[PDB]
Ligand SMILES: Nc1ncnc2[nH]cnc12
Ligand SMILES: Nc1ncnc2[nH]cnc12
């Protein structure tokens with residue numbers, strides 16, 4: 001009850017005394033995307049293992065650092081690597097960083113991920129602006145409500161900020177970067193989906209599928225952080241070849257290759273919001 | 274397992290020592306609806322925190338009392354307020370009162386709740402007779418079966434008693450209270466749905482969405498209790514205005530507003546079952 | 547992370563001392579299909595209670611024996627009965643034997659089950675080759691990956707081996723046994739589905755529904771085990787009579803009736819792999 005609040009405060013104290021403290025935007029760097037850290041200038045690198053009550057990062061392609069610094073001439077806090085429910089963690093553990101971000105004075109959260117394309121018009125390499133999601137992981141707010149952070153029953157009507165989507169599209173046009181928009185479906189994993197599951201999710205309004213994001217987005221919105229999301233389509237959950245197989249490394253490679261274009265958007269978006 | 278039997282009997286023994294005992298019908302008053310307890314004459318009020326093994330009603334707009342008395346000239350046991358999975362309770366705790374009712378001799382259970390309308394003909398203020406449900410919460414029966422209560426694989430072909438539905442429609446017709454009929458979809462919450470979730474659930478057959486009712490209905494049916502169920506449509510999960518937000522007090526005020534019409538149907542229905 | 551490896555090794559070592567160790571194919575016999583054990587000759591029966599770390603079979607119609615011997619002229623190992631999530635076992639518990647089978651040198655898993663039909667052409671007593679599934683149970687791979695068995699993110703594009711399906715098809719034709727083909731939807735249970743739920747899964751591409759099998763397959767696929775799946779349709783989740791109920795004993799009856807034909811396919815199939 002009082003112990004939980006105190007844990008947030010302890011993690012936030014620790015970061016505050018190591019970070020500048022002027023950043024209003026945090027960025028979550030997903031599976032193929034951790035090397036966008038290279039674009040952050042004047043880096044203060046804080047390993048998750050050093051931070052009170054942060055989980056200890058086990059997913060492949062997830063380094064596990066808080067990075068303080070400058071992106072698009074703008075103070076930033078990045079999560080290099082993110083936690084996932086498939087790792088064994090509770091939702092409380094997965095989303096812990098988002099509430100620590102609130103305590104640091106973060107107002108905007110940009111979130112990226114590697115996602116499977118289930119809209120048959122999305123192809124490997126495409127960047128998708130997340131316009132909405134479907135949650136199929138346990139809701140992260142289950143349990144007693146942390147009133148310090150928000151209301152018992154938060155609105156999810158526009159989880160993905162309309163102004164941010166508008167500005168990101170404007171920016172993509174400026175930069176000659178094509179973007180898609182659509183609905184991200186959040187599933188636990190960690191196995192990739194069967195064709196039947198892919199077809200199911202596409203049939204009910206899914207455009208892309210992955211294993212993160214939604215929980216942190218629900219927790220962000222619960223505490224009034226404005227959210228922008230961007231998937232990299234790293235594989236196509238349709239048109240299967242007779243001997244096709246999804247692969248951890250092919251997803252990471254495909255995200256790696258789209259990192260520079262997504263990074264460019266994030267760099268100008270951070271200065272725009 | 275006899276430990277759990279011990280628990281049920283202790284709660285039943287306690288309640289039976291305070292209640293008249295002649296009630297054959299129990300009612301559950303949901304978010305709208307604690308006001309219906311004013312319509313019960315000769316009340317005997319039993320705080321949940323006095324009853325052995327009863328969980329505590331932490332949900333806002335849920336008082337947490339058993340209330341025996343007379344409704345429409347008929348003996349009743351009411352649950353003024355209820356338990357929800359989003360609270361952090363186990364399904365066992367959420368549904369414990371249902372099994373206690375059984376041991377008290379309750380044969381019928383009228384469930385009411387607040388619900389979002391997902392079919393576009395369902396408007397704020399509408400009363401919707403639940404004629405079926407789709408479960409998206411953990412099933413309350415996972416675990417060793419409690420043989421004292423029911424079979425291992427209970428049937429759920431007509432969970433919402435047809436006879437009670439037919440009577441209610443008649444009673445509605447007599448009282449000139451227009452009623453809708455449709456499928457209730459139960460999610461965990463506690464965050465309201467996204468438009469993509471609302472749309473998904475409407476696509477597959479849902480008419481209204483709530484965070485309750487399904488677990489209790491399953492357990493009631495597991496133990497042969499006949500179920501009538503009605504939602505108040507408190508908000509419309511479709512045709513979203515650009516700045517629309519879902520809200521807890523908005524739902525409660527909508528439920529309150531509709532209370533009386535629901536109350537009138539329940540009082541005549543209890544008298545005719 | 548290190549303790550669990552040992553548990554798998556203790557179980558396999560216990561089984562390896564009692565079995566002759568040349569079986570390459572294992573078979574799971576589900577509800578009402580335990581009788582198929584009669585086909586197996588030179589049986590060595592090893593009750594689950596004896597094997598280190600095996601859970602207890604608690605589902606009616608599930609004896610809980612590992613049986614070694616000869617079926618179809620071929621060494622086999624059979625799980626006579628299986629575990630289910632609805633029993634309250636963790637997915638680690640439910641799927642533990644599959645990993646134990648891998649350590650025994652099992653290369654091929656033949657999974658059977660009883661299932662409700664949601665395809666309207668699928669009638670009581672029909673045999674349905676599973677060509678894909680939709681998982682609606684907790685993913686059994688959640689938590690730290692066991693690297694000694696498989697990769698963090700294993701592929702489920704062809705969970706049900708295509709050559710095994712072709713062979714089953716040809717065999718069924720030879721034996722003059724009508725077969726069906728379709729997508730099995732895995733649900734937790736234990737309560738049977740509502741008409742609304744049967745309709746949902748039907749709409750989204752499910753052909754049959756049950757409470758098993760999907761965890762074992764994910765777990766088998768994770769460790770490279772080639773899988774063949776067959777359902778017996780033991781009920782029709784459609785066109786419900788006014789007074790129809792599902793019934794555990796009815797389901798067991800139907801599977802019984804269909805044992806002989808499933809076993810005749812299994813016996814030919816095991817010798818053809
Ligand atoms: N197809 C897919 N489904 C779920 N998560 C993923 N992460 C990368 N590709 C994915
Ligand atoms: N739209 C909605 N979703 C879930 N629970 C509710 N309770 C009232 N309205 C609701």
Ligand SMILES: Nc1ncnc2[nH]cnc12
Nearest residue numbers: 660661662755756757797
């Ligand atoms: N209709 C049904 N639903 C779930 N599991 C089953 N097993 C056999 N019939 C079933």
